[PDB]
Amino acid sequence: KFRVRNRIKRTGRLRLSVFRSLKHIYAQIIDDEKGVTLVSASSLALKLKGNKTEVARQVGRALAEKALALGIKQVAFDRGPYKYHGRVKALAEGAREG
Amino acid sequence: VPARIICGCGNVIETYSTKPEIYVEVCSKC
Amino acid sequence: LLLECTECKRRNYATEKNKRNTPNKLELRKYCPWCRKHTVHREV
Amino acid sequence: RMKYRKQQRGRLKGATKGGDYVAFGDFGLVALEPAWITAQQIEAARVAMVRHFRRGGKIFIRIFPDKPYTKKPLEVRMGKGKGNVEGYVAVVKPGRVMFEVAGVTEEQAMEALRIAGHKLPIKTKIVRRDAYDE
Amino acid sequence: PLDLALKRKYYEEVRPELIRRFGYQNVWEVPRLEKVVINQGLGEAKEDARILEKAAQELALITGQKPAVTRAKKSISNFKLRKGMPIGLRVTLRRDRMWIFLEKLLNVALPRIRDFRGLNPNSFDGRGNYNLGLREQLIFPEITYDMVDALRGMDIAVVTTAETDEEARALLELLGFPFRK
Amino acid sequence: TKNGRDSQAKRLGVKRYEGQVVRAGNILVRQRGTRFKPGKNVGMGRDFTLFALVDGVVEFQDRGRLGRYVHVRPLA
RNA sequence: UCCCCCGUGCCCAUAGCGGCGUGGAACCACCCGUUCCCAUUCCGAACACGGAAGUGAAACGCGCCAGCGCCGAUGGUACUGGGCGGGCGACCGCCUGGGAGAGUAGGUCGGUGCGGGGG
RNA sequence: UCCUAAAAGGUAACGGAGGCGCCCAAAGGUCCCCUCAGGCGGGACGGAAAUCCGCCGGAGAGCGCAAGGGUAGAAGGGGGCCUGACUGCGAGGCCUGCAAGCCGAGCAGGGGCGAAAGCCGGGCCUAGUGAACCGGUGGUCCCGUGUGGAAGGGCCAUCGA
RNA sequence: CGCGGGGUGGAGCAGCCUGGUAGCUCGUCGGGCUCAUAACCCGAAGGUCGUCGGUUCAAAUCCGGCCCCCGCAACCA
RNA sequence: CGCGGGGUGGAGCAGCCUGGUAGCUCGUCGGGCUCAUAACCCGAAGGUCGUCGGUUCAAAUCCGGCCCCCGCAACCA
RNA sequence: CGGAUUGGGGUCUGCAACCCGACCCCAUGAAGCCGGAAUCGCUAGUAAUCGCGGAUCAGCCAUGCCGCGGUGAAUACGUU
Ligand SMILES: [Mg+2]
Ligand SMILES: [Mg+2]
Ligand SMILES: [Mg+2]
Ligand SMILES: [Mg+2]
Ligand SMILES: [Mg+2]
Ligand SMILES: [Mg+2]
Ligand SMILES: [Mg+2]
Ligand SMILES: [Mg+2]
Ligand SMILES: [Mg+2]
Ligand SMILES: [Mg+2]
Ligand SMILES: [Mg+2]
Ligand SMILES: [Mg+2]
Ligand SMILES: [Mg+2]
Ligand SMILES: [Mg+2]
Ligand SMILES: [Mg+2]
Ligand SMILES: [Mg+2]
Ligand SMILES: [Mg+2]
Ligand SMILES: [Mg+2]
Ligand SMILES: [Mg+2]
Ligand SMILES: [Mg+2]
Ligand SMILES: [Mg+2]
Ligand SMILES: [Mg+2]
Ligand SMILES: [Mg+2]
Ligand SMILES: [Mg+2]
Ligand SMILES: [Mg+2]
Ligand SMILES: [Mg+2]
Ligand SMILES: [Mg+2]
Ligand SMILES: [Mg+2]
Ligand SMILES: [Mg+2]
Ligand SMILES: [Mg+2]
Ligand SMILES: [Mg+2]
Ligand SMILES: [Mg+2]
Ligand SMILES: [Mg+2]
Ligand SMILES: [Mg+2]
Ligand SMILES: [Mg+2]
Ligand SMILES: [Mg+2]
Ligand SMILES: [Mg+2]
Ligand SMILES: [Mg+2]
Ligand SMILES: [Mg+2]
Ligand SMILES: [Mg+2]
Ligand SMILES: [Mg+2]
Ligand SMILES: [Mg+2]
Ligand SMILES: [Mg+2]
Ligand SMILES: [Mg+2]
Ligand SMILES: [Mg+2]
Ligand SMILES: [Mg+2]
Ligand SMILES: [Mg+2]
Ligand SMILES: [Mg+2]
Ligand SMILES: [Mg+2]
Ligand SMILES: [Mg+2]
Ligand SMILES: [Mg+2]
Ligand SMILES: [Mg+2]
Ligand SMILES: [Mg+2]
Ligand SMILES: [Mg+2]
Ligand SMILES: [Mg+2]
Ligand SMILES: [Mg+2]
Ligand SMILES: [Mg+2]
Ligand SMILES: [Mg+2]
Ligand SMILES: [Mg+2]
Ligand SMILES: [Mg+2]
Ligand SMILES: [Mg+2]
Ligand SMILES: [Mg+2]
Ligand SMILES: [Mg+2]
Ligand SMILES: [Mg+2]
Ligand SMILES: [Mg+2]
Ligand SMILES: [Mg+2]
Ligand SMILES: [Mg+2]
Ligand SMILES: [Mg+2]
Ligand SMILES: [Mg+2]
Ligand SMILES: [Mg+2]
Ligand SMILES: [Mg+2]
Ligand SMILES: [Mg+2]
Ligand SMILES: [Mg+2]
Ligand SMILES: [Mg+2]
Ligand SMILES: [Mg+2]
Ligand SMILES: [Mg+2]
Ligand SMILES: [Mg+2]
Ligand SMILES: [Mg+2]
Ligand SMILES: [Mg+2]
Ligand SMILES: [Mg+2]
Ligand SMILES: [Mg+2]
Ligand SMILES: [Mg+2]
Ligand SMILES: [Mg+2]
Ligand SMILES: [Mg+2]
Ligand SMILES: [Mg+2]
Ligand SMILES: [Mg+2]
Ligand SMILES: [Mg+2]
Ligand SMILES: [Mg+2]
Ligand SMILES: [Mg+2]
Ligand SMILES: [Mg+2]
Ligand SMILES: [Mg+2]
Ligand SMILES: [Mg+2]
Ligand SMILES: [Mg+2]
Ligand SMILES: [Mg+2]
Ligand SMILES: [Mg+2]
Ligand SMILES: [Mg+2]
Ligand SMILES: [Mg+2]
Ligand SMILES: [Mg+2]
Ligand SMILES: [Mg+2]
Ligand SMILES: [Mg+2]
Ligand SMILES: [Mg+2]
Ligand SMILES: [Mg+2]
Ligand SMILES: [Mg+2]
Ligand SMILES: [Mg+2]
Ligand SMILES: [Mg+2]
Ligand SMILES: [Mg+2]
Ligand SMILES: [Mg+2]
Ligand SMILES: [Mg+2]
Ligand SMILES: [Mg+2]
Ligand SMILES: [Mg+2]
Ligand SMILES: [Mg+2]
Ligand SMILES: [Mg+2]
Ligand SMILES: [Mg+2]
Ligand SMILES: [Mg+2]
Ligand SMILES: [Mg+2]
Ligand SMILES: [Mg+2]
Ligand SMILES: [Mg+2]
Ligand SMILES: [Mg+2]
Ligand SMILES: [Mg+2]
Ligand SMILES: [Mg+2]
Ligand SMILES: [Mg+2]
Ligand SMILES: [Mg+2]
Ligand SMILES: [Mg+2]
Ligand SMILES: [Mg+2]
Ligand SMILES: [Mg+2]
Ligand SMILES: [Mg+2]
Ligand SMILES: [Mg+2]
Ligand SMILES: [Mg+2]
Ligand SMILES: [Mg+2]
Ligand SMILES: [Mg+2]
Ligand SMILES: [Mg+2]
Ligand SMILES: [Mg+2]
Ligand SMILES: [Mg+2]
Ligand SMILES: [Mg+2]
Ligand SMILES: [Mg+2]
Ligand SMILES: [Mg+2]
Ligand SMILES: [Mg+2]
Secondary structure (H helix, E strand, C coil), rough: CCCHHHHHHHCCCEECCCCCCCCCCCCEECCCCCEEEEECCCCCCCCCCCCHHHHHHHHHHHHHHHHHCCCCCCCCCCCCCCCCCHHHHHHHHHHHCC | CCCEEEECCEEEEEECCCCCCCCCCCCCCC | CCCEEEEEECCCCCCECCCCHHHHHHHCCCCCCCCCCCCCEEEC | CCCCCCCCCCCCCCCCCCCCCCCCCCCCEECCEEEEEHHHHHEEEEEEEHCCCCCCCCCEEECCCCEECCCCCCCCCCCCCCCCCCCCEEECCCEEEEEEEECCCCCHHHHHHHHHHHHCCCCCEEECCCCCCC | CCCCCHHHHHHHHHHHHHHCCCCCCCCCCCCCCCEECCCCCHHHHHHCCCHHHHHHHHHHHHHHCCCECCCCCCCCCCCCCCCCCCCCEEECCCCCHHHHHHHHHHHHHHHHCCCCCCEECCCEECCEEEEEEEEEEHHHCCCCCCCCCCCCEEEEEEEEEEEEHHHHHHHHHHHHECCCC | CCCCCCCCCCCCECCCCCCCCECCCCCECCCCCCEEEEECCEEECCCEEEEEEECEEEEECCCCCCCEEEEEEECC
């Protein structure tokens, strides 16, 4: 079911691998062609609270900071296995806010 | 609704299923 | 069946192909003229 | 049988795969020379062999005719031969094992396997079974 | 409506006895009743949606749930079916929706089954599963007599989390599945 | 005796080989289906043709179960 | 530096099938429920949301096993650019450079890059 | 279309085999979802084969039609919205005696789907076709025989093999 | 060796182009009128569609091969 | 293409003028009558009258378009 | 309606009721919705209809036969 992930890959650059467990949410901004990650604003692994949807927003705006900290902009969003809906969407919601 | 299985051999059971006027002829009590 | 889509409120045409007896009695798809830009287009 | 239709001739280059070793049986018959062996030729040897030792052991036939044999009815040049006149044949290259006999004495295998050699368009040879296996 | 006779029967009666007979390790090795599905292979109302509807909503009452259709794939000239047009009326149901139906079934339907003798002991598919056919569909509770315009029956299957079917046999007997044994 | 038929040859195959300069968008491989897949700066058209999107050199790569890919490693 | 787990890429079966064992403290799964966001041609199966309690059963991570799958030489032969000889032929042999498929010996239950949590 | 065709391309014979002179407003664009054939077991009518459940089952199904190549990390099945089955172009090539055939990034206009990245100039692809001349219908910066119109012609579009 | 047409209940014909359902006449079998048989009347049964193979969901019907019947044709030397 | 005239019972046609009207022949079944088919006599079912829209109180009828078969000549680069 | 068929249980004759009796009771409850071409009977106390008896003979496969009475029609223009 990594069809999404494939198409995205043949688009160019800056993959946003939103992973999400049953109370978790993460995001690597990974550059293929070399196979290397940069910004990696986690959540459960970071520190944040506990309310998934709520948790998303920040964990999203978290990448945001660390992104422009290096000069970045490609939104290339790895809407992984998960539909663009809740915690996944909200993860973006904020990732773009900042 | 809470169904009402009315049978001639006692065994009057409740469950769920529209209109609880369930006159069962010979239920599992016999 | 060969067809030529006229533009509505005008008199243009297009390279077309209805299908007559197969569920295509109608025909008014959306197309794009050189006068103005973008409108409906009848069978004709 | 089934396959499909008529088939090109193709040559009979060196007897590479053209050959084998004795599979079953006490003795056998090998081809010394390349040729197309006809259906008829085969059966000719078979029935010969049996006829020799009536009520006898077992004759194996390691070769089998599957090449279609085209031929023209005494004419000229339109289309490819309706063919199949001799019918079918088997590509026998030097070395191949063609018939195995078993359940008989040497003097019987030798004789029968020899008589068969008289029906075949080829120089041949009869083998014991040395031991060379695998 | 989380609560009911049969719902609890499994927990506060069957469940523990399974630990006796087999006795596992983890609570999730104990065989779960967790899937039951109706179905009505009707090449019968295959022609018209009239005879097709009543059997669906009729089905809807007995199950209590909203029935689903199932279309054909291949093509059968021997019985007049091509693309997928036709029909089979299947409906999956789990959770408490199923416990409620099973209560009715194992205690009202099977009972009112003409010359019932207990579910055929052999209907287990080697794995922890059981199925059964039924003629008259009227052997169901809410179903009225003057309601049926045809004796269109149907068949059902019930899944376990068990691996072998002795566990399923044991499981189902305890749960009130009258087997012909 | 009906049989004298055939179609005319379509002359297809790899057109530019590995280690060969290429201009902006010239064809690289004409193929029946997907004997080859796209790659870095290498798209493909309706007939599954494979052409350059940039200049630079062509390189091939076998990715086993994945497929055989062809791309241009640019330079300027 | 090291080890465990999590997300991701790479070589693309020596990574796989099956068998056996193993971990839930963190992680991950399942589990609780379906008010709300949203969802089933019917079913919260799936996707989706809120969320403790329970669990390592299933899934998955790890590891041991070769029975199957997969990899697999060496030697040798077939064939063969280039050179030469022989039989009416169907064909065959020599020199120089190249050289398999099969089968054999044997190998395998993988390896590794980046990032993040955990001692 | 495949073989002959001798591992580039090409390559003949009244050599071996088979198709084409269409079709689809959904069989098209996109967004989301989904994965077969077949084999064993279990199932009321069914019955080798409808529909149902289980397990095994990497492509032997499917892709409108012949065959081949491709293909489930979709090109296959379902849905929602839709109409790029665009207009103005076109770097650069394949192919080729000529004429013709074919692939095509990207630019402007203006639009569809989508959160976005982005995709859309018909259909998985390779057949489904006909130079020129003569004429028909719609249009339109143009020409209009002393001048103004008109007749007629040109240009664009499409039609009759 | 060529080209064209055809093989369908016991007999002779239809159906096939434009695939779903095999029809007509005589004959056959049962019954009736007659003293009886024919005629006539009433009712019924009967066909692997030449054979092998394919396309289709499905073949008498479409496509390919073999077998048998009929029609034409086989010239210049 | 433009010209002309029609789609009426299981078959056609009369009815279409100049709107107030479905009947004809055979056919189906039943009854009468015959040695008997049949002729014949009585009675009954089987027509959005190709289709939609409009005039009118009222149409098959007058009118528009459409769907189809028939016919007319005339054109084909 | 109609009572065939089948199951089950039983009585009686007669040495004996498998083949093969008759009857009883329960249950089972068939085809049949008035019958093709064709064809029989009857002219008044007749047809139709409804029972009763007798010969035979242990019993009876009698719905048969011979006889008895009860209720009691229709219609005959005409002799082609
Ligand atoms: Mg909030
Ligand atoms: Mg941002
Ligand atoms: Mg209910
Ligand atoms: Mg009881
Ligand atoms: Mg229209
Ligand atoms: Mg037109
Ligand atoms: Mg010969
Ligand atoms: Mg000659
Ligand atoms: Mg011996
Ligand atoms: Mg010996
Ligand atoms: Mg000899
Ligand atoms: Mg010899
Ligand atoms: Mg010798
Ligand atoms: Mg050997
Ligand atoms: Mg288990
Ligand atoms: Mg297990
Ligand atoms: Mg040719
Ligand atoms: Mg070709
Ligand atoms: Mg050629
Ligand atoms: Mg070719
Ligand atoms: Mg250090
Ligand atoms: Mg260091
Ligand atoms: Mg890498
Ligand atoms: Mg295990
Ligand atoms: Mg635990
Ligand atoms: Mg619970
Ligand atoms: Mg609810
Ligand atoms: Mg609540
Ligand atoms: Mg709300
Ligand atoms: Mg909420
Ligand atoms: Mg959603
Ligand atoms: Mg729904
Ligand atoms: Mg909530
Ligand atoms: Mg614990
Ligand atoms: Mg534990
Ligand atoms: Mg486990
Ligand atoms: Mg595992
Ligand atoms: Mg191998
Ligand atoms: Mg090897
Ligand atoms: Mg070697
Ligand atoms: Mg050499
Ligand atoms: Mg040489
Ligand atoms: Mg030399
Ligand atoms: Mg010589
Ligand atoms: Mg080797
Ligand atoms: Mg081997
Ligand atoms: Mg070994
Ligand atoms: Mg292994
Ligand atoms: Mg393993
Ligand atoms: Mg690390
Ligand atoms: Mg670390
Ligand atoms: Mg650390
Ligand atoms: Mg080719
Ligand atoms: Mg090939
Ligand atoms: Mg070649
Ligand atoms: Mg080739
Ligand atoms: Mg060569
Ligand atoms: Mg060559
Ligand atoms: Mg060759
Ligand atoms: Mg080649
Ligand atoms: Mg040839
Ligand atoms: Mg044409
Ligand atoms: Mg559509
Ligand atoms: Mg299956
Ligand atoms: Mg099984
Ligand atoms: Mg069954
Ligand atoms: Mg079946
Ligand atoms: Mg079955
Ligand atoms: Mg494949
Ligand atoms: Mg096909
Ligand atoms: Mg195909
Ligand atoms: Mg090829
Ligand atoms: Mg193919
Ligand atoms: Mg293929
Ligand atoms: Mg393939
Ligand atoms: Mg294929
Ligand atoms: Mg798709
Ligand atoms: Mg498509
Ligand atoms: Mg769509
Ligand atoms: Mg160009
Ligand atoms: Mg050119
Ligand atoms: Mg073309
Ligand atoms: Mg070309
Ligand atoms: Mg397609
Ligand atoms: Mg091609
Ligand atoms: Mg000219
Ligand atoms: Mg012109
Ligand atoms: Mg003008
Ligand atoms: Mg202009
Ligand atoms: Mg002027
Ligand atoms: Mg002017
Ligand atoms: Mg002048
Ligand atoms: Mg002047
Ligand atoms: Mg003038
Ligand atoms: Mg003009
Ligand atoms: Mg003009
Ligand atoms: Mg005939
Ligand atoms: Mg014939
Ligand atoms: Mg004939
Ligand atoms: Mg016939
Ligand atoms: Mg005949
Ligand atoms: Mg005959
Ligand atoms: Mg005969
Ligand atoms: Mg014919
Ligand atoms: Mg007759
Ligand atoms: Mg007779
Ligand atoms: Mg007679
Ligand atoms: Mg007589
Ligand atoms: Mg007679
Ligand atoms: Mg005579
Ligand atoms: Mg009769
Ligand atoms: Mg008759
Ligand atoms: Mg007859
Ligand atoms: Mg008959
Ligand atoms: Mg018949
Ligand atoms: Mg035939
Ligand atoms: Mg038939
Ligand atoms: Mg002649
Ligand atoms: Mg002369
Ligand atoms: Mg002459
Ligand atoms: Mg006229
Ligand atoms: Mg007529
Ligand atoms: Mg008339
Ligand atoms: Mg008339
Ligand atoms: Mg009449
Ligand atoms: Mg009628
Ligand atoms: Mg009519
Ligand atoms: Mg009508
Ligand atoms: Mg006609
Ligand atoms: Mg005519
Ligand atoms: Mg006329
Ligand atoms: Mg008693
Ligand atoms: Mg009857
Ligand atoms: Mg009655
Ligand atoms: Mg009496
Ligand atoms: Mg007596
Ligand atoms: Mg009497």
